[PDB]
């Protein structure tokens, strides 16, 4: 259908779990932006699969996993993920137009982070996107032709010369990078395809397509909490730029929202709770950089739902809240005496206004609406009424099957 | 509705004309990407309006013109456009999240162009987008607070120091840029708004929104003829990233296609015709850098229609073809003995396969389907059948009113 799964907060909402849970019903599962800054996590029958760039349809061999054109690819790292699975040939395809992360990029990221202090993943995501905007970047299809690759590498070496000292590239950068591609190009080349053509066709034939967002909406380069964002567009619309699909192809948009909020890295966080009331969240939800913890923020949620056109919500990680005395929800902002109901473009001086809810004790592992505590259902009802989007999926532990459908 | 007007070739298709022609029927007209690399041109009653970043609803005072968040803004240049119109306050709004083009950017563009030779507009578009990906860029909202602006300017000056020689910035860069903002910030600040909120609301209230693409689909940074592209996403999906609108809000997608093709700048162009058969196109269609001229390319058109989800086409500049003996249409590609029907990701060795059509003599200024020569209608019929999208608008001169609706 091109349905889309999107994180509607600042990442870590539980996207990997939801994609894995529904992927069996699709022909294609598509990672459309970001890189291995992502960590989409699947748990099933006590086995944890930590994915980075590998799409989250990988546990269903009939699914075709697509890494689309707006992604940035650390080839070595993707090769390491490929090696963990059997017979990925014919069920993983990497866009020939995806951009390639070089070691300069990670070094540059660390260098710039000394002044900017965004809290990046230090994986060179941003600098890879920069080179894409410069139109100097290498793309996956370049690896298919030794002569083209060699030429682009020589232009890169020439271009980075003035930076070797600053970014601490070392004496052997150029020989090391040559050898890198000698090692990894043969490993990844069989998977490189025109995925744009592939998805245009699939859409035309009415095959079922699931688009897997990374990061989350409030990390969007344009509309998120800039400059405390990633360098890619994270919303549902981005899925129908990366891919070849058009906006009219988008059917369901599933907004993945944790039952509380996190950020990892710096930047504004209106509902962050550094008081003892937040300590439960830290104990069970901070954890690898520990996440900043706080409450669900309906102001921000409503904003993200509008940006994405969510048709349904998945409410994630209810089990983290088990045992908490009370749950707060940020229902509005106070800014110097004004009540704000709408998410503003600058969060300066925005203080959360909270409603308090009774906690629950034992959502963990519940598989039926009937088996949930009243206080859980009361919370769900409040959220979906305030936001105006039905909660259709409820996750009660990391396990694939600990998921309730409505 | 959020309808979208998109250029489905490499720019210069006649977008400005179509937006101006239909804008009276909308509440909002939104420029969603690019900058003053654009030149959307309107002619009405013998007056030519050359727009660059100003949206093409400006001649209808009841329209609200929006410059959205994914645009890059040369403030001085926008101020110069503002000064050509009366009472723009309350009918032009500039996103507080739009990025700001600095003089370093244009210089950097010219510097890099010595090695890359893309054929950019040398307006610093690409380097502005680079700084956006770096998350070091200045945005329009920063101009609203003198202290914030001063801080970002000081970080910029520190960051550009190693480049002053290379990019030939000059002794007085820093004092000149300080004075620039002293001059232009007061002029532009009244127009700076949260346009994301504004369009979310308008969409919720069912107000009519027209989204005005710049450049064209084959210039898209991800899916166009990389590296001979612009540094922004140009398709209909990009309109529902920049803006706050979601993909489900998109209704009509009007693909603007010239009756022949141009490119300006370097890069692949399968249907380019440098033979005498193309000379008519050059005489009447090259013209300020002259455009490379060639034939309509249905392979590329079908690709762009899929990317955008076009619901209708506008066929533009029929008058340029008046007097030509014969018109060719590229219906497929030959690549080393293989017939390709689908646009590939690499145009190496793709040679056009042509069908030839009889020309016409006097489409210029015709306002009724009935008054068109048969050979014009035969061409239209062929195009819309091969592409599978109805031609609903036909332009027979630059003049607003020389437009036929079906
Ligand atoms: O998967 C993710 N989860 C949470 N935050 C992320 C993720 N990927 C990137 N980020 C955040 O996005 C911002 C930019 O990091 P970058 O994507 O490495 O440039 C930082 O705040 C990161 O911590
Ligand atoms: O309005 C436009 N018309 C046609 N080509 C454009 C336009 N804007 C940018 N381009 C082209 O897009 C490419 C990149 O230019 P840039 O947008 O200045 O970086 C070049 O091929 C330009 O000639
Ligand atoms: C849930 C969670 C993840 C995984 O979430 P995705 O959206 O699948 O990336 C990662 N880290 C933390 C701390 C989490 O709570
Ligand atoms: C038509 C045309 C333009 C204007 O087209 P837009 O899509 O409005 O930018 C500019 N230059 C040339 C050569 C043209 O033919």
Residue numbers in the entry:
A (entry chain A), B (entry chain A): 1 to 287, 293 to 411
Quote the study on this structure.
Furthermore, its growth was notably hampered in a medium abundant in nutrients. These results strongly suggest that AdSS is critical for the survival of H. pylori. Using a broad set of microbiological, physicochemical (UV absorption, LC-MS, X-ray analysis) and in silico experiments, we were able to prove that PLP inhibits adenylosuccinate synthetase (AdSS) from H. pylori by the competition with GTP (IC50eq ∼30 nM).
C-His tag AdSS was complexed with two out of its three substrates (IMP and Asp) and with PLP, in the presence of Mg2+. GTP was omitted, as according to the studies described above it competes with PLP, hence we expect to find PLP in the GTP-binding site. Our findings reveal that the AdSS-ligand complex crystallises in the I 1 2 1 space group, with a monoclinic unit cell of dimensions 69.9 Å, 62.1 Å, 119.3 Å, 90.0°, 98.9°, 90.0°. The asymmetric unit contains one monomer of the protein (thus half of the functionally capable enzyme). Ligands bound in the active site are IMP and PLP, even though before crystallisation AdSS was preincubated with four potential ligands: IMP, Asp, PLP and Mg2+. However, the long side chain of Arg135 from the neighbouring subunit extends towards the active site of the paired monomer and participates in the ligand binding, namely in binding of IMP, thus indicating the necessity of a dimeric architecture for the formation of the catalytically active AdSS. Phosphate group of PLP is clearly visible in the electron density. The aromatic ring of PLP is bound covalently to the side chain atom Nζ of Lys322 utilising for this purpose the aldehyde group of PLP. The distance between C4A atom of PLP and Nζ atom of the Lys322 is 1.26 Å, thus confirming formation of the covalent bond formation.
